Structures are given as C-alpha cells and as structure tokens.
Structure 1
Amino acid sequence: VTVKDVNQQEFVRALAAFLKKSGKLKVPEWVDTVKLAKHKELAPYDENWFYTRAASTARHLYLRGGAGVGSMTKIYGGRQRNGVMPSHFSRGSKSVARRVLQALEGLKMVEKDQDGGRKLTPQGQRDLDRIAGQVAAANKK
C-alpha cells in the first residue's frame, strides 16, 4: 500500500495530521500574513497549510525523483484573473515552497539531491508512507 495504493487525497489529510501531532517542523512568521501565491485572491482558511502542503510537497517528491523550488512553484498553479483581462498561469510563491522544502529538511524528510533539486531521504520516505499503511488500514471505506 504505497502512496499510490492509498487514495492519494486522504493521504495528505493524515500526513498533515502527522506533522501536527509530531509538534515539530518549523512553522514561522510570514505565515498568518501570507498570500500563498500572487495567483490567489485571498489568504487560506485552514490556518495550517504548510503542515498539509509540506505533506503534499513531501509526498510529491516521493512520486518524482528530484524537484526544485522552481518545480514546486510550477506545480501549485491556477488561473489568474487580471480581471477584465483573460486568465493566465502564474507560478506559486517560491518563499513558501522553499521554506517547505527547507523545513522538511529539518525533520529530514528530504535532502538536496545530486544534480540539483530536492528529493526525499529514506528516513522521510518512511514517515510519509508509514501512515499509508495507517490510512489504508485506518479502515476500508
């Protein structure tokens, strides 16, 4: 039951829980006043993205062998009303995906790969998908 075998959207639900119920990661200060990406209209409601997004980011690295900040920005996109203008694609915030990577690095979920870009390290490779067992075997539903 790898990250794929678990129905991937109720993965990060529990992986967000993991890193909350650990009580360590390194939550910071641009936090309560963050846009998330110039992309968006409005600061996000669940006051706790980066436990749930570092979840995403970290599992994402599981699926993909290497990923830069430039990559993370790319992936969390959207359309962007410039208003009466047509919608276009704007990269996500770097700062936040970066500090997500650097923070995952603190727990040592991840590491900097060779040839540039972050990938996840064996230790983290665990915490990630350990709970995959726990999410499949939470219950069949």
Structure 2
Amino acid sequence: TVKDVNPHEFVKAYSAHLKRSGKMELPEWVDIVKTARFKELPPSDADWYYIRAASMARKIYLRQGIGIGGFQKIYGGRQRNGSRPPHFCKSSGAVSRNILQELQKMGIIDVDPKGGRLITSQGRRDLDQVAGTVP
C-alpha cells in the first residue's frame, strides 16, 4: 500500500492524480503567497498546491486528529534572522486550513470529533489504489 511505496514518488503520483482527477477550487492568491513567514520566495513550482495537497493527505492517512496548529509545525522550519541567530518558525495557517477544507470538498478526509482531522474510508481507498500504481 502507501507504506510500500517511496514517499517521494508516491507524492508525485498523487499530486498528478488530483490534477487530472476532476478539479477543486484554487484561491485567487495561490500565485502570491509564500506559505511561510520565514520563506523568501513563493513556491518555485506552479503546481505546488497539488503537491502540498498530495503530501498532506498522506499526513492524515498515517495519523489521526491533526489540527491546523500542528500542520503549521509540520511545514515550519528554520528562519534566519540576519545578524541574530536563526530559530524555528511555523508556516501559514491559511493554506493549511484551505487544503484540508478542499479535501473535505472532495471527500478524502473529514473533520474529527475529539478534534482534528481523519482520513475517510473512500480517501483511504484511493490512496491505496494510487499506491498500487507506483513503480
């Protein structure tokens, strides 16, 4: 299944799935937002939203009940403060919330009582289907 495929080629395969599998909405700020306070430029690849989606539905598929203030820590990283020492900074909550809301508006994941987000039965199904098709 998903743990038998390398997580790089799998995310490439899934992020190609959501592309040619129907569609989802895409905000009217996707081309301008940096995805993190500490980032320097927006994501280099124009097809990053889908990557960020395919990489992100694998998080809920291997875990259970992850909020947004946990995804911000997931995709946060090192922030360099110029002449002061660098520290750890969290990414932006707007993209994190929006991709989950879209996965809801496709039925891959759903919000969870007791808080958090959980993979759906059908969302589990297509992830293992696509996993079956990765070299």
Q: With structure 1 as the length reference, what TM-score do the two structures score?
A: 0.91
Residue 95 of structure 1: CA displacement? 0.2
Deviates more, 1:11-20 or 1:124-133: 124-133
Q: Partner residue of 1:3?
A: 2
Unpaired stretches in structure 2, ≥5 consecutive residues: none
How far apart, CA to CA, are the structure 2 residues paired with 1:89 and 1:129? Answer: 34
1:61-72 correspondence runs (5 A) = 61-72=60-71
How far apart, CA to CA, are the structure 1 residues paired with 2:109 and 2:58? Answer: 10
Q: Partner residue of 2:82?
A: 83
Residue 125 of structure 1: CA displacement? 1.1
How far apart, CA to CA, are the structure 1 residues paired with 2:14 and 2:99? Answer: 14
How far apart, CA to CA, are the structure 1 residues paired with 2:57 and 2:3? Answer: 14
Matched pairs, number: 135
Q: Partner residue of 1:49?
A: 48
Q: Which amino acid aligns with 1:118?
A: R
Q: Partner residue of 1:30?
A: 29
Percent identity between matched residues is: 56
Q: Which runs of 4+ in 1 moved over 6 A?
A: none
Q: Which amino acid aligns with 1:10?
A: E
How far apart, CA to CA, are the structure 1 residues paired with 2:79 and 2:26? Answer: 28
Residue 92 of structure 1: CA displacement? 1.0
- Secondary structure class of the residue paired with 1:89: strand
Q: With structure 2 as the length reference, what TM-score do the two structures score?
A: 0.95
Residue 122 of structure 1: CA displacement? 0.7
- Secondary structure class of the residue paired with 2:110: strand
RMSD: 1.0
How far apart, CA to CA, are the structure 1 residues paired with 2:104 and 2:25? Answer: 10
- Cα shift readout 1:52-79 (whole Å, capped 9, x = no counterpart): 1111110110110110011111100110
- Cα shift readout 1:9-48 (whole Å, capped 9, x = no counterpart): 1111010000001131221112011111112111111112
1:102 has 2:131 as partner: no
How far apart, CA to CA, are the structure 1 residues paired with 2:129 and 2:38? Answer: 34
